[PDB]
Amino acid sequence: GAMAPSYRVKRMDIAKNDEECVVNAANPRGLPGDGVCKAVYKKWPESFKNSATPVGTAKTVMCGTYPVIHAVGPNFSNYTESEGDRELAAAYREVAKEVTRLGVNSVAIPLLSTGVYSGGKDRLTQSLNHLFTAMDSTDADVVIYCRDKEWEKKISEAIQMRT
Ligand SMILES: [Cl-]
Ligand SMILES: [Cl-]
Ligand SMILES: [Cl-]
Structure with missing residues (x-):
């Protein structure tokens, strides 16, 4: 647990993150895919051993x-x-x-x-609100990664609104 659990947003490649673990926006078949998934495949390819999982689920594999x-x-x-x-x-x-x-x-x-x-x-709002619903009861520091300059501003505003 973090001493003062927080939300933050950064506009950069999630493959360069400074956190203790990463969430891949995966496909159900454990394929290299495109976008975030292809960046994650290039950085942590060992993590795609038996990573296939159904829609609506998460499966952790160590790199x-x-x-x-x-x-x-x-x-x-x-x-x-x-x-x-x-x-x-x-x-x-x-x-x-x-x-x-x-x-x-x-x-x-x-x-x-x-x-x-x-x-x-x-x-943006639909996905970010489901992120908050799930992660608000956790005590991890959460760092949201995005690529678009206007999305960064909107995610930052939504975080700051709750304080
Ligand atoms: Cl970058
Ligand atoms: Cl997507
Ligand atoms: Cl984005």
């Missing part, structure tokens, strides 16, 4: 002693808005269980289902 939590958000191209929302909330709840089980003091996390799984919609 050395460094934990990679593979979290599979829904692809909103394939899911209804209702069932996709349920699966996206569930994936973050499994991330909070894994972060707790590992006993880490810090975790690097991307916004699940906001890139090529977004079904072409802006899901």
